């Protein structure tokens, strides 16, 4: 929202993210407060968080592939009366 990957003069230089860093340092490990982020773009983010002592490693969440699509369909269609011959095992097998 501040341009992004072109933007203006800035080294990701955020008024807010810096505060998250400040509070993520002054936090004792003994309190069991685990912080999870999520970014649609893995590079334009500030490199100051991806440093040891803070959010350290990156997990890559791929697109659903085969079993996950069957599970997602059967979790969306769990509230509504479905027929008997509705072949979710085929519908998820087709949509790649």
Partner 1 sequence: DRTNSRSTGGKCGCGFKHFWDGKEYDNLPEAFPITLEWGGRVVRETVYWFQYESDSSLNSNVYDVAMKLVTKHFPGEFGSEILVQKVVHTILHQTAKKNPDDYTPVNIDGAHA
User: Which residues contact partner 1 (rule: CB under 8 A)?
Assistant: 5, 43-44
Least distance to partner 1, CB of residue 8, Å: 13
Name which of 35 and 44 has its Cβ closer to partner 1: 44
SS (H, E, C) the chain: CCCCCCCCCCCCCCCCHHHHHHHHHCCCHHHCCCCCCCCCCCCCCCCCCCCECECCCCCCCCCCCCHHHHHHHHHHCCCCCCCCCCCHHHHHHHCC
Name which of 47 and 53 has its Cβ closer to partner 1: 47
Name which of 44 and 91 has its Cβ closer to partner 1: 44
């Amino acid at each position: 929202a501040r341009g992004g990957n072109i933007g203006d003069g800035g080294g990701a230089a955020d008024r807010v993210i810096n505060q998250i860093l400040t509070e993520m340092d002054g936090m004792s490990t003994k309190k069991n407060v685990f912080i999870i982020g999520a970014t649609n773009r893995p590079d334009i983010i500030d490199p100051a968080i991806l440093r040891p002592g803070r959010l350290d490693q990156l997990i890559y969440i791929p697109l659903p592939d085969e079993k996950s699509r069957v599970a997602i369909l059967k979790a969306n269609l769990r509230k509504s009366p479905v027929a008997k011959d509705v072949d979710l095992e085929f519908l998820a097998k087709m949509t790649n």
